[PDB]
Symmetry: C2
Subunit: 569 residues, 2 copies
């Protein structure tokens, strides 16, 4: 039919088969109730002493116990398939957003993404299972009801089934006519209400002219008109209910009139009529739900379509073949112009950055708008629009994503934290690679030895949600320890730590210097000390690299950096 | 239960008595139908004799016809009371709406006041009528149903009545317990969803650290937990409906068990249980409606208190005793400082402007305000905060409101016209006073006679809503003719035309000059020609008269007059 994620469900059929076969019993039981109704009324409650009012009290409760157990098992075992389908769908979907470009997560639809994964995943299988159980049970109650209703007094069955749609369509046409009549009559009431508003509007003119009495008379007339219009409207609306009631009663009266003639006689009995009528009445609800099933199956398998769109959206480019054993290379730029998608302003103009290996460079972004993007390019998160980033004699486009991202490390005050323990967080994705002693040494080199050692559970304290919830400074220290453990030749320093912790942010800074004492570092300078620590100052204005050079060179000629050293004060 | 609304009910009480007595039958019919249900099954169908089941068609159609006619008469005659009472309330409200000060109509709006007059009164009447219908009909139905249940089987009725509340309360407590369980597990589901968001939010971190596999594993674990939580929640929710069904079935089983086990009643024939059970089931609707009725009463009656407050607000001041027919007396704003009620900014200050008799002393300004109110004070729509405006040497407060208003005429391009004929509009509020020839003379003086006689129906053509929708300029001509007819000694022009019709605006101007060769008027002028026609130019800048003098002197002294004048040009 419409969507066919069928393979994902294919494994979980046994559960679905059991649920369905136990669910059809959930209508077999309801039908057997009304089946037992006939012996009850005709034979039991009559002057017949007993044995239909002693066996029946037990059987009704036993069969309801069966109904309850089948309902529970059907619901649970369809919820098993729903759970094991929604869980696999969610798992696949998420596993196809961990290799999906940052562009989508650049607030293209990021806010809804959790909603997209959870609400829609819950809705797809929820609505599909609802459609199944409403097109099996309520689609089986109908079948069993018909079997019984033709088993009991088929002639009455026919005279009732032919009447039901005729009466239904007659009711529909009468209701349509009267609804149209009332809606049409509403127009006159609207007109007179507009006249009332008009009369209320002219307060000033009425008062200045002393027409209070004349306006009272005119309101008398329009209000009599309004009351008469309401009278006729209410009369027309009220004469609807008696008409439909009379039509239904006429249907019943004809049904019984047919009972007089010998055509259906001996199909009357006493119970038989009750069971047939009760079955026909109770047939509406199953059919009422069945006629609407297509809406549900569709809403749900369509959300599945919406989910499919995400599952098959753009994927991160991976057109690389070469790997890295060590990125002991020189970072090189040449006319590197880039623009982050979903925007019009160009990000970067031509670039000629020759950041050599073994030495660091501090880029200063006093403009403060879009500067960080320059770092995102070297880490291949937003694809470069124009130019190339020449790394170790090769471009990143040519180079495999995994190795490239591995060689570069990010550090920021807003660093995210995982939900596992701190020891794993430090060696995230490579816990087996390094021994706990290595992690402790990294923490030492991160100058958070006392802090990390003082957590309640020590080295393996749960560090994320449902944990101790460190502050920003401690998070920075553990991120620095992460970088130390990974020993990325390329460092990216956010330097967003506007907060100055006493005796600790200086410890943090010592950790930063030790980390960047070696290795090539690109520091998005925002603090004073880092600018002081600058090795090759790189200024940028809006989207262009205005100047480059060491501290003294740009300090001598005011240009940009020198004035920045003053407005930064 | 405030019920100031008692006197209105007493004249139409007869209609209410009818409505009620017919409504009683409107439930007696249903009761005597369920009564028919007994013999039908007991001795109508099983037996060969068909007299019962051949009469039953006739009796059922007859009872439903009585139901239809009695429902129609009840609804009609209750809506008639609700119509001739909502109508009298509406008419009384309006009659106490033309006595309200302009301030009340200004703070609120037509559409809010129309909602009050139209929607709120309709709710008052409709909801009180609905409360009465529910109480009477459903109380009659309940009393009749109880009579039936205790009459047909005084033993089964007692057991049913004892069981129903116990079963209902047990169902309620079970439902409450299971709802609490479901939400107590929904909280854990929310926790795991928050964890899912936590992990799904670290896209940049996962990519940079290359931990796609580890994050996939963690999501596997959390998704397993989510599926387990959903499974447990669904199981808890689905073990409820079977439990309530089991409780209801146990109730029914015990009822039937008592129906046989003892010989206490032992009298239940096939018909007696059918009728008693069907009534007990059908007794839910009235017990529910009668329980919810108190939300109808004191919801419409509260709207009646709202309408009383809107009716029982600050009436316009009428502290005047002396009546003056026609006055050449100057309107002098001696020391009059006024501010808009409901507003903060001072509208006026102590002023010295005087209006000599005969002289068409005018007033000009570009402040965009101040002027607007300086005329309204003469009409006393708004009151005065300080000072006194002297008519015939007497303050307007001393002057009788009706007579003083009659002495002033409101002529403006933005003028309201009543839903009446042109003759009625011109002689409005005094149609008896003036002859039709005088109205033709008024049209002549309006210089619109050619147009005034051009409509299809001539001088008596309907001019307002449901009329010709006359353009603004000729509507202003109509208002001008109104002024000429009434010959108000005091006149306050608006002259906000800003639209110069070819040869018709000049005719309008000719009409104004014919009007203002007499009839002293501080002409609120936006027209340079009107300013030139001024006698004693008066200039105000948003809080006070800057100067008052002839046009030549005012022009000579630049002050503020010459500047605003040359901006006008």
């Amino acid at each position: 039919t419409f969507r066919r994620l069928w393979p994902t469900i294919a494994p979980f059929k046994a559960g679905l088969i059991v649920a369905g076969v136990a669910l059809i019993l959930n209508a077999a039981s309801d039908t057997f109730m009304l089946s037992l109704l006939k012996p009850l009324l005709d034979d039991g409650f009559g002057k017949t002493d007993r044995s239909v009012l002693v066996w029946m009290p037990l059987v009704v409760i036993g069969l309801m116990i069966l109904r309850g157990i089948t309902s529970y098992v059907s619901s649970y075992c369809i919820s098993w398939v729903s759970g094991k389908v929604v869980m696999t769908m969610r798992r696949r979907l998420f596993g196809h957003m961990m290799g999906m470009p940052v562009s989508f997560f650049d607030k293209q639809s990021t806010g809804t993404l959790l909603s997209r994964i959870t609400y829609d995943s819950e809705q797809v299988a929820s609505s599909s299972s609802g459609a199944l159980i409403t097109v099996v049970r309520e689609g089986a109650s109908i079948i069993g009801l018909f079997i019984m209703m033709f088993y009991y007094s088929w002639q009455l069955s026919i005279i009732l089934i032919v009447l039901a749609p005729i009466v239904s369509i007659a009711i529909r046409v009468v209701s349509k006519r009267f609804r149209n009549i009332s809606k049409n009559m509403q127009n006159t009431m609207g007109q007179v209400t507009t006249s009332a508003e008009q009369m209320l509007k002219g307060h000033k003119e009425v008062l200045i002219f002393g027409g209070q009495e004349v306006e009272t008379k005119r309101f008398d007339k329009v209000s009599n008109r309004m009351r008469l219009q309401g009278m006729k409207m209410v009369s027309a609306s009220s004469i609807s209910d008696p008409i439909i009631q009379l039509i239904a009663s006429l249907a019943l009266a004809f049904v019984l009139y047919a009972a007089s003639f010998p055509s259906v006689m001996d199909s009357l009995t006493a119970g038989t009529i009750t069971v047939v009528f009760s079955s026909m009445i109770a047939l509406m609800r199953p059919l009422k739900s069945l006629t609407n099933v297509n809406a549900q199956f569709q809403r749900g398998m369509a959300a599945c379509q919406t989910l499919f769109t995400i599952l098959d959206s753009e994927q991160e480019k991976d057109e690389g073949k070469r790997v890295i054993e060590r990125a002991t290379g020189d970072v090189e730029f040449r006319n590197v112009t880039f623009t982050y998608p979903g925007r019009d302003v160009p990000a970067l103009r031509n670039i000629n950055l020759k950041i050599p290996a073994g030495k660091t460079v501090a880029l200063v972004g006093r403009s403060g708008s879009g500067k960080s993007t320059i770092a995102s390019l070297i880490t291949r998160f937003y694809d470069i629009d124009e130019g190339e980033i020449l790394m170790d004699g090769h471009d990143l486009r040519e180079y495999t994503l995994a190795s490239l991202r591995n060689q570069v490390a990010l550090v920021s005050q807003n660093v995210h934290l995982f939900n596992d323990t701190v020891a794993n967080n430090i060696a995230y994705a490579r816990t087996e690679q390094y021994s706990r002693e290595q992690i402790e040494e990294a923490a030492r080199m991160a100058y958070a030895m006392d802090f990390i050692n003082k957590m309640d559970n020590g080295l393996d304290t749960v560090i994320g949600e449902n944990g101790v919830l460190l502050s920003g400074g401690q998070r920075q220290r553990i991120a620095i320890a992460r970088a130390l453990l990974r020993d990325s030749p390329i460092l990216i320093l956010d330097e967003a730590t506007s907060a100055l912790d006493t005796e600790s942010e200086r410890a943090i800074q010592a950790a930063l210097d030790e980390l960047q004492k070696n290795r090539t570092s690109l520091v998005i300078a925002h603090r004073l000390s880092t600018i002081e620590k600058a090795d090759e100052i790189v200024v940028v204005e809006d989207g262009v690299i205005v100047e480059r050079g060491t501290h003294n060179d740009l300090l001598e000629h005011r240009g940009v950096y020198a004035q920045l050293h003053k407005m930064q004060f």
